[PDB]
Amino acid sequence: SMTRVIEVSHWGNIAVEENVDLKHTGAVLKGPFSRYDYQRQPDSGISSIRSFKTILPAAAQDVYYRDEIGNVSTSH
Amino acid sequence: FGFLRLSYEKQDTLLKLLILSMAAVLSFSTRLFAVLRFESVIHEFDPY
Amino acid sequence: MELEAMSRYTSPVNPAVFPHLTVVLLAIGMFFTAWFFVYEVTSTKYTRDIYKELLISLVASLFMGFGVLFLLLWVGIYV
Amino acid sequence: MITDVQLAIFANMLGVSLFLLVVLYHYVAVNNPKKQE
Amino acid sequence: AAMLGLMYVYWTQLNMFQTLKYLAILGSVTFLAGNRMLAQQAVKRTA
Amino acid sequence: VRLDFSITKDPAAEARMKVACITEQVLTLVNKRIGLYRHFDETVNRYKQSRDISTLNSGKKSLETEHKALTSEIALLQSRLKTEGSDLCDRVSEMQKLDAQVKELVLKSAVEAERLVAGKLKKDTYIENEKLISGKRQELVTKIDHILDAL
Numbered sequence: 001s002m003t004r005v006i007e008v009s010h011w012g013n014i015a016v017e018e019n020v021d022l023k024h025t026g027a028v029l030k031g032p033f034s035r036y037d038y039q040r041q042p043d044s045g046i047s048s049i050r051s052f053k054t055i056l057p058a059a060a061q062d063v064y065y066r067d068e069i070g071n072v073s074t075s076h
Numbered sequence: 077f078g079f080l081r082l083s084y085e086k087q088d089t090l091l092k093l094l095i096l097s098m099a100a101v102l103s104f105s106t107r108l109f110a111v112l113r114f115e116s117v118i119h120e121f122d123p124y
Numbered sequence: 125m126e127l128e129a130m131s132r133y134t135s136p137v138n139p140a141v142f143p144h145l146t147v148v149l150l151a152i153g154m155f156f157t158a159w160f161f162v163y164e165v166t167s168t169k170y171t172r173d174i175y176k177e178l179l180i181s182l183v184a185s186l187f188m189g190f191g192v193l194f195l196l197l198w199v200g201i202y203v
Numbered sequence: 204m205i206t207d208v209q210l211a212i213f214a215n216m217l218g219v220s221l222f223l224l225v226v227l228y229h230y231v232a233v234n235n236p237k238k239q240e
Numbered sequence: 241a242a243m244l245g246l247m248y249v250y251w252t253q254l255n256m257f258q259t260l261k262y263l264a265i266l267g268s269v270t271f272l273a274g275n276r277m278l279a280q281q282a283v284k285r286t287a
Numbered sequence: 288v289r290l291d292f293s294i295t296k297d298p299a300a301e302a303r304m305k306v307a308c309i310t311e312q313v314l315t316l317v318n319k320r321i322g323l324y325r326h327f328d329e330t331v332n333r334y335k336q337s338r339d340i341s342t343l344n345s346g347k348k349s350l351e352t353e354h355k356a357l358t359s360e361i362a363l364l365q366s367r368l369k370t371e372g373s374d375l376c377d378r379v380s381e382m383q384k385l386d387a388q389v390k391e392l393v394l395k396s397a398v399e400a401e402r403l404v405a406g407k408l409k410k411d412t413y414i415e416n417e418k419l420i421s422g423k424r425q426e427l428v429t430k431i432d433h434i435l436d437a438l
């Protein structure tokens with residue numbers, strides 16, 4: 001599910017916030033998840049998804065990335 | 077001589093208001109260092 | 125009545141203006157507000173006039189109230 | 204938003220000024236004749 | 241007298257929030273009457 | 288601020304507040320009296336430049352007409368101050384006594400200017416005579432200022 005909220009203000013600004021719920025629908029993982037193996041070997045968890053890129057509007061300003069429990073600093 | 081012509085009662089009250097007003101501003105402002113440097117989050121274990 | 129046929133709109137007050145307006149309006153409001161309080165505390169039953177108090181209060185409220193709006197926009201909390 | 208460097212300078216300036224003003228208040232208070240009346 | 245009476249009504253039916261809402265109005269009127277009455281009594285005593 | 292829910296009044300506070308209200312009123316009036324001297328001094332300067340006696344005469348009559356009203360008002364308020372038992376009532380009369388000395392000194396300056404324009408008084412002598420009148424006038428003002436603070 002995704003909820004897209006668009007607010008237009010007469011003071012020269014429109015603010016858009018999108019709430020995204022994401023689920024990985026690939027084959028279910030079986031057995032324990034080894035952090036040590038995952039870091040050490042490139043092949044480990046090859047199906048797993050690490051990151052994705054979003055193409056935003058050219059004029060987008062003050063972009064913020066956060067979660068329910070606080071900010072997330074990993075986005076570039 | 078502008079300050080002198082004012083009554084002393086005016087001078088004492090004016091200084092009293094200015095000193096107290098500033099002190100309130102400093103008390104609130106000084107506590108914002110964490111919120112600016114880091115995200116606006118609850119701190120410590122007990123507050124949660 | 126389509127976007128290309130019609131014109132475009134922007135706020136009359138440009139963004140760069142906002143910092144200057146907020147500072148000027150608030151300072152004027154503050155000066156009158158201080159004057160109102162000092163006059164009230166110093167004044168006594170026989171030394172106070174309603175007409176003077178109303179004029180100072182009304183002027184102070186007008187200047188500061190507009191200044192606050194510019195402050196909110198400058199901060200970015202658009203109404 | 205203001206950076207932490209700006210906030211620190213601001214805090215120091217206000218505090219120094221405020222303390223000096225309290226010293227000035229002491230000056231007028233003693234200097235006051237009606238206080239001794 | 242009414243304010244004291246209100247205590248019993250709270251005992252049977254009202255809750256804390258309702259009792260305060262009525263009490264504030266009743267107290268205000270009682271206070272105004274008391275202040276005017278006391279000033280008159282003070283003048284009589286000092287005469 | 289207007290509302291007071293008081294029961295028992297304090298006459299001493301009420302009278303003390305009343306005297307202060309009168310005291311500032313007296314202060315304003317005396318300041319106006321000093322201002323009247325300032326206008327009269329300006330009138331003397333105008334008289335010297337123009338050499339027209341009529342201009343000074345109108346200024347003088349205005350001074351003794353407005354000033355006399357101020358003095359009478361000051362005495363009338365002083366009567367109330369004396370009625371309250373304020374110790375200042377003698378002081379305000381004392382200021383008026385000094386004020387009369389200033390008033391005559393101002394008159395002495397006016398006549399000296401008239402003689403200087405007429406040539407009865409030499410400029411070289413006039414400078415010293417004006418200096419003495421102004422210096423004593425300033426000293427009287429200095430006395431008035433201290434007692435005014437005493438109010």
Ligand SMILES: *[C@@H]1O[C@H](CO)[C@@H](O[C@@H]2O[C@H](CO)[C@@H](O[C@@H]3O[C@H](CO[C@H]4O[C@H](CO[C@H]5O[C@H](CO)[C@@H](O)[C@H](O)[C@@H]5O)[C@@H](O)[C@H](O[C@H]5O[C@H](CO)[C@@H](O)[C@H](O)[C@@H]5O)[C@@H]4O)[C@@H](O)[C@H](O[C@H]4O[C@H](CO)[C@@H](O)[C@H](O)[C@@H]4O[C@H]4O[C@H](CO)[C@@H](O)[C@H](O)[C@@H]4O)[C@@H]3O)[C@H](O)[C@H]2NC(C)=O)[C@H](O)[C@H]1NC(C)=O
Binds near residue numbers: 073113
């Ligand atoms: C709350 O959360 C929010 C959201 O997370 C926080 O804000 C976010 O903070 C992060 C912190 O890192 C910011 O990250 C910044 O991202 C940009 C974009 O990075 C991508 O593009 C780069 C562009 O590179 C181009 O050119 C090179 C060749 O030169 C090509 O290879 C590229 O393909 C591009 O064409 C690119 O370099 C980046 O690659 C890096 O990362 C990827 C993986 O993501 C690796 O594979 C790469 O090898 C490489 O490591 C990436 O693709 C970066 O440009 C920013 O880098 C600057 O800032 C870094 C510190 O943040 C610093 O380490 C870098 O050296 C660089 O430094 C900049 O500033 C320096 C002065 O201080 C200059 O000296 C220097 O030249 C440069 O200007 C950076 O990583 C997010 O932007 C930011 N997000 C938002 C929305 O604001 C927020 O802080 C949190 N609040 C908290 C915690 O309180």
